[PDB]
């Protein structure tokens, strides 16, 4: 009975196109994008994206339809199908210890969707500065294998795990193999035995090792893996074998990959990022109370042929001031009264 | 002095002599140059008596174009350069056509309209990129001394028209395309009942509809942002920036729509 037509003022952000990118992130290097000042549709997102599981928390399912928001953050990463039971609301296992942390306070939704593995790739970049500083390369993994971690540590801006050769030669016994430490950083705290024995991952007492067991938080990334101090040795070029504390897992399920996505909405019932699901529901004009481009009225519609419309003129008005026709901006179908 | 934010103070000086010229070209609206089409209406073989916002028939333009090479004076930002946006403005812009390596580039100034130019309020920015026009109505933080920087022949300064780490609360963002090899572009801007309406045209024809946005506030000041270029002068070429503007007022016009809808003859009720 009601035909609502109105051109949007803000463009579309294509959340589905960003979720279906050829470069799929990893549990460690989970990506995001601040979607704002756009319109999002739930039906198209659930249709195009192959939805497998969907839930929410601190908000109703029907509440998302129609409500406006200020910003949307989509924290996505490929599912490690091995550890799927770790993605629980309030978990502290292997997943939520060195990876993305689930939001509990604000309204947050969770989605688990499949994606074809054809011509797709998995990105496993390490978003750490002190890791890339001390000679970090890659992991040399195979296709369709995502990298995650459980233990996460941190160091200081002037901490050299690869000690200076002077400190190594000063301690005749219990000397750690290490090359020339670069400048601008203090050497490793160390016959003088050093700290963090036998490895920074597992220690007898955390007070004797300057690398403290750090955890993740809301939007916080792991500062880096547990790089072994006495396993490098070039100006402290660390071998890729000295980077421990990580793990790799496949994502093959019915010959397809799986990706989890956490949606965080900021600005409940505010902002301009509104959902056009409640208004744009029928979108089918039958040959009727209409609200077209702000003009409200009542009348019957018919299908005729017309070619006298420009690229900015949709409504047809007469010299008296009444509307007698219009053009649908979605199907180019001219409907006259 | 348009906004309130410290942006830069390296090249800041004063001046004593800048007159904004007054073109001898009177406003001729008999051929349809000076009017605008309706928002989204189509007419065929009719005479529409439209009571809208139009410039004064047979008036003069005030050139608010400002160019610069090394320095810019604070007097350029003070009145009367910041004219009182009472009802609206009709602007004629000279499409600066530069030739670099036998290819063409289109350049002209940008427009910023705001009440107090504070991020707690809404301001509209119209920026011409190469072949594109970007319109953004956002809560931009306007710089103290904004200026547009050349991107086709280089500029010593850097472009500074807003400072925002994240995207502010925008109400309208859109892009349009225009012909790059044009001579004079025309623009119409006005406000009514808290709604801002804009129109544009590439050639000497009535301006086409751009957008209409509801704000609820009252716009106070419009500004044509100056341009900083290195090779636009008297030593490298002989063409400059000519931005003419005329104030709008509420008046009644008569437009003639032909069989197709093209405006042929428009008349004003002021003899
Ligand atoms: C919205 O606009 C307001 C008004 O400009 C912004 O407040 C201004 O923010 C700047 C940058 O933080 C302040 O500059 C600083 O001033 C202090 C002295 O108070 C100085 O020591 C610093 O070196 C720096 O120059 C400025 O003072 C401040 N204005 C006022 C009146 O306090 C605000 O940041 C803008 N917000 C957004 C989100 O854009
Ligand atoms: C925007 O969201 C609405 C809300 O779901 C969509 O409307 C549904 O469309 C599907 C088919 O596209 C129908 O099967 C449903 O019955 C519609 N919902 C209702 C309540 O009628 C709409 O299609 C979406 N827009 C686009 C372009 O996909
Ligand atoms: C409705 O008609 C317009 C006008 O032809 C179509 O817009 C054109 O779309 C094609 C392909 O997407 C482009 O190559 C043209 O440049 C577009 N022209 C203009 C003027 O925008 C539009 O695609 C049509 N829509 C439907 C659903 O048929
Ligand atoms: C309107 O056009 C401008 C100019 O091309 C677009 O700005 C570009 O945006 C892309 C992607 O964000 C950047 O890679 C370019 O560097 C930008 N160019 C400039 C000159 O800033 C803008 O995105 C367009 N907006 C819309 C809604 O189409
Ligand atoms: C942009 O403007 C130029 C300048 O008028 C247009 O070039 C004209 O094109 C017509 C059509 O063939 C010719 O008859 C004129 O002789 C051309 N004039 C000049 C000075 O070259 C150009 O066509 C316009 N762009 C578009 C897309 O229409
Ligand atoms: C802009 O036009 C002026 C006027 O013709 C040019 O000035 C002349 O330049 C030629 C060549 O350098 C001299 O021989 C004349 O004596 C100049 N006349 C005057 C009155 O100064 C000027 O060169 C042109 N601009 C450019 C960049 O060529
Ligand atoms: C020829 O000089 C121009 C130019 O380079 O194109 C032209 C003109 O002299 C002037 N620009 C304006 C709008 O007045 C401008 C200023 O006179 C100078 O650039 C110096 O201006 C200041 C404020 O120092 O210089
Ligand atoms: C990659 O696979 C997807 C899923 O089948 C498909 O949509 C896309 O077109 C493919 N890309 C190429 C370049 O074949
Ligand atoms: C990666 O591992 C494969 C396994 O045999 C090996 O052939 C290849 O040389 C390795 N590449 C690097 C850069 O380590
Ligand atoms: C603006 O900031 C610059 C440094 O970026 C400073 O030199 C200048 O004094 C400031 N202007 C003020 C505070 O008016
Ligand atoms: C413009 O930005 C560049 C990039 O850092 C900088 O090197 C240059 O000094 C800036 N120019 C001015 C005039 O501030």
From Swiss-Prot, chain B:
The residues that the database entry marks as glycosylated are 6, 16, 45, 101, 119, 158, 175, 179, 238
BetaCoV S1-NTD domain residues = 1-271
Disulphide-bridged cysteine pairs? 7-143, 138-170, 150-229
Q: What does this protein do?
A: Attaches the virion to the cell membrane by interacting with host receptor, initiating the infection.
Protein name as it appears in the record: Spike protein S1
Organism field: Human coronavirus HKU1 (isolate N5) (HCoV-HKU1)
Task: Provide the gene name from the record.
Answer: S
